[PDB]
């Protein structure tokens with residue numbers, strides 16, 4: 370999930386935007 | 391300056407990117 | 412929605428539970 | 433104190449309340 | 454009250470330090 | 475720089491003045 | 496409005512704290 | 525668990541700014 | 554009032570940074 | 582070591598929300 | 610006044626997020 | 639690790655408060 374992905378290595382804004390509605 | 395500009399009307403992350411190094 | 416309900420008058424932490432999954 | 437307790441393990445809301453007046 | 458004094462005008466770090474223990 | 479200087483050990487607010495304009 | 500944008504940042508922080516393992520939905524409408 | 529808790533706090537603030545008026549769900553996890 | 558509520562969040566963070574090891578009392 | 586300093590910042594913000602008008606002392 | 614001051618704190622957080630490892634110059638002037 | 643990314647967020651917030659009149663230059 371998002372914590373596993375983005376607390377392992379930095380998520381870009383593009384990567385974060387995948388988690389938006 | 392930027393605070394007046396962006397505290398009067400919302401500045402998007404796209405708009406803010408041009409202020410990066 | 413949460414902005415209408417909580418951005419003028421303070422929503423308690425108990426009221427904010429309404430927006431938990 | 434609160435740092436030794438709550439920066440070693442996550443304090444819940446209820447546990448934090450221990451530290452209110 | 455800090456809220457009355459520092460949300461009604463901007464308080465410097467020096468002014469805020471008065472509220473320290 | 476600031477990350478080498480301040481993300482390993484705590485920089486005081488005096489130390490952080492090094493990065494003011 | 497900017498005020499609502501600033502309010503929302505604080506709302507998300509509060510929901511993160513209140514909701515714990517449940518998580519939350521942020522739906523500004 | 526504290527480190528993950530703190531990281532998640534930062535993450536939801538970033539998602540708030542990226543998603544804007546679309547909002548988002550935060551679902552541990 | 555939400556504006557006061559939100560201001561207080563910033564006050565407590567600034568006090569945390571200013572007061573350092575001394576800590577502070579937050580009394581609304 | 583910075584993690585206690587950074588965690589403390591998050592902790593006072595959480596205390597502010599939990600304690601409300603009751604207030605709190607912050608004392609490391 | 611205080612409004613501006615606190616809004617500016619959020620503004621620099623948004624700059625930080627978008628700029629990442631590049632960093633940024635901030636002036637209120 | 640993401641630690642330095644998260645620390646930078648805290649750094650900028652502190653710089654905003656310390657460097658009131660003239661702002662700051664954040665270069666990691």
Ligand SMILES: *C(=O)CC[C@H](NC(=O)CCCCCCCCCCCCCCC(=O)O)C(=O)O
Pocket residue numbers: 372373374376377526527528530531552553584587588591640641644645648
């Ligand atoms: C909740 O997420 C359950 C998920 C869980 N595990 C993972 O997702 C993977 C492990 C996360 C790595 C955490 C590293 C975060 C580093 C944070 C820095 C700590 C200090 C922060 C100080 C500051 O506030 O800046 C699972 O079970 O899958």
Ligand SMILES: *C(=O)CC[C@H](NC(=O)CCCCCCCCCCCCCCC(=O)O)C(=O)O
Pocket residue numbers: 412425426429524
């Ligand atoms: C969407 O576009 C908003 C539209 C609006 N709908 C509403 O405002 C209704 C939202 C759903 C929740 C209503 C539940 C009503 C029960 C009130 C409980 C009050 C209890 C006090 C404690 C507490 O605040 O939790 C519309 O267009 O109709």
Ligand SMILES: Oc1cccc(O)c1
Pocket residue numbers: 374375376378379380381531534535538626640
């Ligand atoms: O990978 C991450 C974690 C937290 C905030 C962020 O912008 C990115």
Ligand SMILES: Oc1cccc(O)c1
Pocket residue numbers: 396397399400401402497500541616617619620621623
């Ligand atoms: O226009 C603004 C002002 C403050 C924060 C932000 O993300 C945008």
Ligand SMILES: Oc1cccc(O)c1
Pocket residue numbers: 417418420421422423502505506509555558598
């Ligand atoms: O009503 C609100 C608005 C923003 C944050 C909060 O804890 C409550």
Ligand SMILES: Oc1cccc(O)c1
Pocket residue numbers: 438439441442443444512526588591592595
């Ligand atoms: O144990 C903690 C530490 C920091 C914030 C929090 O909500 C709980």
Ligand SMILES: Oc1cccc(O)c1
Pocket residue numbers: 459460462463464465560563564567611655
């Ligand atoms: O007057 C204020 C109010 C809130 C935070 C701060 O640094 C100053």
Ligand SMILES: Oc1cccc(O)c1
Pocket residue numbers: 480481483484485486570583645648649652
């Ligand atoms: O050393 C640091 C790192 C981040 C914030 C701060 O106030 C000090």
Ligand code: NA
Pocket residue numbers: 412415524
């Ligand atoms: Na609506």
Ligand code: NA
Pocket residue numbers: 504536537538540541
């Ligand atoms: Na945010």
Ligand SMILES: [Zn+2]
Pocket residue numbers: 501505559563615619
């Ligand atoms: Zn704010």
Ligand SMILES: [Zn+2]
Pocket residue numbers: 530534587588591644648
């Ligand atoms: Zn942090």
